[PDB]
Design a protein around this ligand. Sequence first.
Ligand SMILES: *[C@@H]1O[C@H](CO)[C@@H](O[C@@H]2O[C@H](CO)[C@@H](O[C@@H]3O[C@H](CO)[C@@H](O)[C@H](O)[C@@H]3O)[C@H](O)[C@H]2NC(C)=O)[C@H](O)[C@H]1NC(C)=O
Ligand SMILES: *[C@@H]1O[C@H](CO)[C@@H](O[C@@H]2O[C@H](CO)[C@@H](O)[C@H](O)[C@H]2NC(C)=O)[C@H](O)[C@H]1NC(C)=O
Ligand SMILES: [Cu+2]
Ligand SMILES: [Cu+2]
Ligand SMILES: [Cu+2]
Ligand SMILES: [Cu+2]
Length: 499
Amino acid sequence: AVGPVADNTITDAATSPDGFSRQAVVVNGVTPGPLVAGNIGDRFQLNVIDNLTNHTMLKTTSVHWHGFFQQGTNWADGPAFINQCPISPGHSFLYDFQVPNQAGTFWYHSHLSTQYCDGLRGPFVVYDPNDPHASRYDVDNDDTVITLADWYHTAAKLGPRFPAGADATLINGKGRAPSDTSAELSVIKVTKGKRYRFRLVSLSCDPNFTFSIDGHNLTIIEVDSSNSQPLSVDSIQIFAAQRYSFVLNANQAVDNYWIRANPNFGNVGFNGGINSAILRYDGAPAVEPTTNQTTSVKPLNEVNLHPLVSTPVPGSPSSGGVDKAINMAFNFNGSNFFINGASFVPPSVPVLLQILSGAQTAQDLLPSGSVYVLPSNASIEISFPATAAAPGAPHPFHLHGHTFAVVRSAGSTVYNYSNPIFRDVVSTGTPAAGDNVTIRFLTNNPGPWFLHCHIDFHLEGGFAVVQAEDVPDVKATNPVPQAWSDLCPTYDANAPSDQ
Ligand SMILES: *[C@@H]1O[C@H](CO)[C@@H](O[C@@H]2O[C@H](CO)[C@@H](O[C@@H]3O[C@H](CO)[C@@H](O)[C@H](O)[C@@H]3O)[C@H](O)[C@H]2NC(C)=O)[C@H](O)[C@H]1NC(C)=O
Ligand SMILES: *[C@@H]1O[C@H](CO)[C@@H](O[C@@H]2O[C@H](CO)[C@@H](O)[C@H](O)[C@H]2NC(C)=O)[C@H](O)[C@H]1NC(C)=O
Ligand SMILES: [Cu+2]
Ligand SMILES: [Cu+2]
Ligand SMILES: [Cu+2]
Ligand SMILES: [Cu+2]
């Protein structure tokens, strides 16, 4: 919709996506924010204009472009105090980056504190004119993007540290809460006889969602920006920050069908049309579906997903057969999460700025014990053993700057070194199953890259580490614009009540 070159204006505004009015952070007047789009090869120049006025939801901001490698533009990645200081209120900041080697479904969100939960999140699509899946569908446009979100009546800083589920699930920005069971539902329109590439984007800040459409099956063709072989499913459990493209054939009777996105906790089920939207065939009356849900008999399993094209797994086909193996031991003490004994606290000098200032070893980099220095041009294996020591499972972990092979998925004891799916957000499963979700990637991208749980409340409690990749080359590889250099002095000159 907007972009590749566009202004994104950030403001606080009253919204009522479920009929309950509340102040939120909005992008060009709306939450979820508008669709940002371009084509593979494009240069994006997204001018983020911070016109925020509300300290409780943060007057400063920083935007992450989720799933993009940002090779040579690490300064544009978004995480506050990792890749930049926040943009200050009354200022604007230009994110200027290219997407030469990626296409698919992405999203964008605040990467400052828990601000994205308050509304600053939207979908982001990069189209491929030669899409290898093009023959599988007829329609792929603004109207085929489906966003899912958790929505809270109380602002992120004002409610419990770890909320017990959302008030409403939003599908394309609308949904029902208990407080109003007649609130307007989203309608997704289809013309009978056409095949649609639906790009399902989880903008969720906590809960995962089990997504299904009554009377319709789905063909998964994309997994977080990576093209997959066509997998036929009748439901999709989608974790916070994940994306899927699925093909829906609009081949059923002209009618209204329930679209369902059932959260893992909170207000579960569908009483009064909560957790729901409407699939309306052209010509069907403007009423609610009366369709019934059927048991999922072909649910998505991550182990069933494989890349469309042969994609080699980094390293060699054996446990720890990589250049560097890292294990992440989780802890939690009631308020903070710890990875290998360290709870992440953002440094005063952003990690990138520290590196540009000469800090190139784990010893010199802050915060102490949260930064992992990675050798260049190397295969890396990271395991995330599920433990009851860290409540809140299943934790979806996200690695910035990279896609990774999921060598072992949640619910599986298999190590797949041949043809596992590659993605950027992975469920780390549950301790009950003794899960030990393990990933692999190559260090082809100099810069500090965040690695964290994407449940934003957990990130906020410190559930994060930094992967500092090829530190001696970072400065040369990612030359920084004057505006970026100006962010920290400006931010540090703010009255704390204007932050
Ligand atoms: C800054 O943004 C915050 C967070 O969105 C706003 O906080 C809001 O603060 C008011 C209290 O002034 C809360 O009002 C309570 O509202 C409920 C629901 O309507 C009502 O039943 C209570 O009697 C009471 O009025 C409100 O819940 C809270 N908002 C959220 C989303 O947590 C604050 O108002 C904003 N500042 C400005 C100047 O707009
Ligand atoms: C979606 O996929 C499911 C699962 O394959 C299909 O369910 C089969 O449906 C036929 C015809 O109604 C029955 O004979 C079988 O018993 C069903 N199999 C199972 C395991 O449930 C369903 O038909 C598909 N729906 C559409 C609209 O294509
Ligand atoms: Cu993200
Ligand atoms: Cu990301
Ligand atoms: Cu988590
Ligand atoms: Cu992140």
